[PDB]
Amino acid sequence: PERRVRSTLKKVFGFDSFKTPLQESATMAVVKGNKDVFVCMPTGAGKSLCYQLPALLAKGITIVVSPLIALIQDQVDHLLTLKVRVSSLNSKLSAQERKELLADLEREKPQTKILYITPEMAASSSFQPTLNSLVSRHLLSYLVVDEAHCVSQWGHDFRPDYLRLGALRSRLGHAPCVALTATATPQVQEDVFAALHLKKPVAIFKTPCFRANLFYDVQFKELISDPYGNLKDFCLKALGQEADKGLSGCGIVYCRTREACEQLAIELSCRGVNAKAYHAGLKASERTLVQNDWMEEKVPVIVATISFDKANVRFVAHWNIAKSMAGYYQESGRAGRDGKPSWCRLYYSRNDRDQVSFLIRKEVAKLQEKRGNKASDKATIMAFDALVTFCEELGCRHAAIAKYFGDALPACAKGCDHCQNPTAVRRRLEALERSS
Amino acid sequence: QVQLVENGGGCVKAGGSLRLSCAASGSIFSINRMTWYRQAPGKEREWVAAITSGGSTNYADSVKGRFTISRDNAENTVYLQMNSLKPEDTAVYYCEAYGTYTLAPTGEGEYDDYWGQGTQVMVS
Ligand SMILES: [Zn+2]
Numbered sequence: 001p002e003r004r005v006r007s008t009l010k011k012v013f014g015f016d017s018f019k020t021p022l023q024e025s026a027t028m029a030v031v032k033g034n035k036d037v038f039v040c041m042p043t044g045a046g047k048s049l050c051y052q053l054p055a056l057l058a059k060g061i062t063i064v065v066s067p068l069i070a071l072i073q074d075q076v077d078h079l080l081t082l083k084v085r086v087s088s089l090n091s092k093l094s095a096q097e098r099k100e101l102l103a104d105l106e107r108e109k110p111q112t113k114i115l116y117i118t119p120e121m122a123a124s125s126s127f128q129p130t131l132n133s134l135v136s137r138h139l140l141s142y143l144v145v146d147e148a149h150c151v152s153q154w155g156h157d158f159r160p161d162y163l164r165l166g167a168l169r170s171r172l173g174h175a176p177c178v179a180l181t182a183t184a185t186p187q188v189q190e191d192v193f194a195a196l197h198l199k200k201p202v203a204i205f206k207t208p209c210f211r212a213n214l215f216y217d218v219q220f221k222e223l224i225s226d227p228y229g230n231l232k233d234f235c236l237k238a239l240g241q242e243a244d245k246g247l248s249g250c251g252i253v254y255c256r257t258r259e260a261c262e263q264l265a266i267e268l269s270c271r272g273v274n275a276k277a278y279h280a281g282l283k284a285s286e287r288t289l290v291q292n293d294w295m296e297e298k299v300p301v302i303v304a305t306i307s308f309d310k311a312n313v314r315f316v317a318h319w320n321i322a323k324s325m326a327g328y329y330q331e332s333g334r335a336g337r338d339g340k341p342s343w344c345r346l347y348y349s350r351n352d353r354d355q356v357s358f359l360i361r362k363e364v365a366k367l368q369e370k371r372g373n374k375a376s377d378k379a380t381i382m383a384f385d386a387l388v389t390f391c392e393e394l395g396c397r398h399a400a401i402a403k404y405f406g407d408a409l410p411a412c413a414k415g416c417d418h419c420q421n422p423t424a425v426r427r428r429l430e431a432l433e434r435s436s
Numbered sequence: 437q438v439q440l441v442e443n444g445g446g447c448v449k450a451g452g453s454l455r456l457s458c459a460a461s462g463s464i465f466s467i468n469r470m471t472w473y474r475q476a477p478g479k480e481r482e483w484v485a486a487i488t489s490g491g492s493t494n495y496a497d498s499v500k501g502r503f504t505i506s507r508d509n510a511e512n513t514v515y516l517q518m519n520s521l522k523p524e525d526t527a528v529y530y531c532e533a534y535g536t537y538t539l540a541p542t543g544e545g546e547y548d549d550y551w552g553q554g555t556q557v558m559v560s
Contacts, residue, residue, distance in 0.1 A: 204545035
């Protein structure tokens with residue numbers, strides 16, 4: 001019940017209570033073990049526990065499948081510092097160590113109770129008698145597939161062995177399966193469900209990408225008479241809410257063209273708000289110095305350029321639209337990590353959208369020349385189309401983000417451009433259409 | 437859960453037409469495919485119509501000419517209109533609603549498939 005999981009959360013993990021109620025529900029669903037569970041949570045949300053704590057409670061050994069050996073080793077070390085009885089059979093062991101591990105596995109009451117195996121070694125010929133003994137023994141209790149998204153062709157990563165993991169799942173049917181992905185799209189979710197032969201009832205536990213204390217709004221650089229003036233007003237307002245409070249935290253401003261990023265930083269500085277370019281081309285010493293002066297409060301706002309974190313971020317303002325809605329959502333995610341309300345601005349532009357679309361098309365053409373990962377190119381084009389629709393579309397911005405990422409529609413009573421002032425959005429899109 | 441309800445079942449003479457309705461209640465993010473199954477007395481279930489995402493329609497070579505399937509995703513409703521009905525199609529009709537994906541503002545969801553109770557059609 002609840003008491004057992006709570007005890008585990010404190011004795012072996014150290015946490016007093018679950019970070020979020022959603023993962024509490026997910027972990028209890030896995031513990032019940034009635035049906036296959038698909039948990040999609042961001043990194044640092046504790047998704048690991050959703051397969052780790054149930055395994056700590058599982059009657060028998062849990063087989064975890066991860067793409068790379070290095071990730072398996074990192075998880076093994078994290079489990080070992082907690083003194084948990086974890087093992088790995090990836091052939092990483094020498095001869096004697098492999099013999100000992102096989103001897104513990106083959107005998108009853110296996111000492112290993114969570115085994116990290118790359119799919120190759122699970123489907124390797126030599127390991128088949130061991131797996132047959134495991135199933136016949138009924139030792140396997142959970143069949144976790146970490147980074148399950150690698151099975152889906154439309155995902156950013158592809159794993160050919162995760163396809164045969166579906167047949168593996170078809171074997172050892174008596175045990176449930178837990179599929180985990182850092183981020184999930186409904187199409188990717190469908191691919192995961194189909195390829196892994198999971199049971200038809202699947203418990204999907206997905207974090208709502210919606211964030212109450214985030215304000216989402218979009219403006220069209222053609223409509224606004226002076227874009228830098230709007231950027232300055234936004235920066236001032238977000239940075240300083242009241243005279244007594246004074247400037248707080250720091251802002252972020254993404255931009256694709258570095259030549260434009262330096263210009264934006266210098267223009268902001270000249271207007272009155274200091275900014276530091278932090279463009280990737282800059283030398284390592286200078287980039288470190290900038291990242292530092294931003295961590296301290298000396299620098300008000302930092303221009304991310306291609307690449308970026310701080311506890312409080314007053315605002316994010318994309319001078320240019322992002323390549324993919326996943327990228328834009330991640331970039332805006334660091335907005336307002338603190339409780340206080342923040343803001344997220346997208347200065348969507350037809351010319352910039354055309355430029356980045358052409359760049360995406362050229363990249364897809366190069367990929368096709370490679371003759372591989374065609375589904376990846378299709379997914380990238382689909383994501384860019386989704387982002388441009390998001391900027392164009394009339395309606396609740398949070399709702400469109402939820403539609404793309406597939407989580408439920410959010411009830412943002414406050415903190416959305418459309419909901420609060422639909423007439424303003426109507427007028428703005430009418431002006432944009434007239435301009436175009 | 438999702439409550440599928442059939443409607444429009446009627447007894448039409450040979451040559452006439454009648455429409456069937458299949459509305460999916462509950463909160464559904466999307467549906468993979470709604471398929472109208474036809475089952476007669478003393479016979480194996482036979483597949484009649486299928487509507488998938490994007491409006492793709494799959495029929496039976498013989499049954500294709502008579503029936504037409506049309507779905508609305510926003511409404512979550514699929515209509516199977518029967519034209520030039522024949523005395524052979526005297527079977528009960530069901531919906532499959534294969535691959536139903538449901539979710540809540542919290543985050544909990546399900547991906548099970550749900551079946552409608554059924555609608556009857558008799559032909560002179
Ligand atoms: Zn809204």
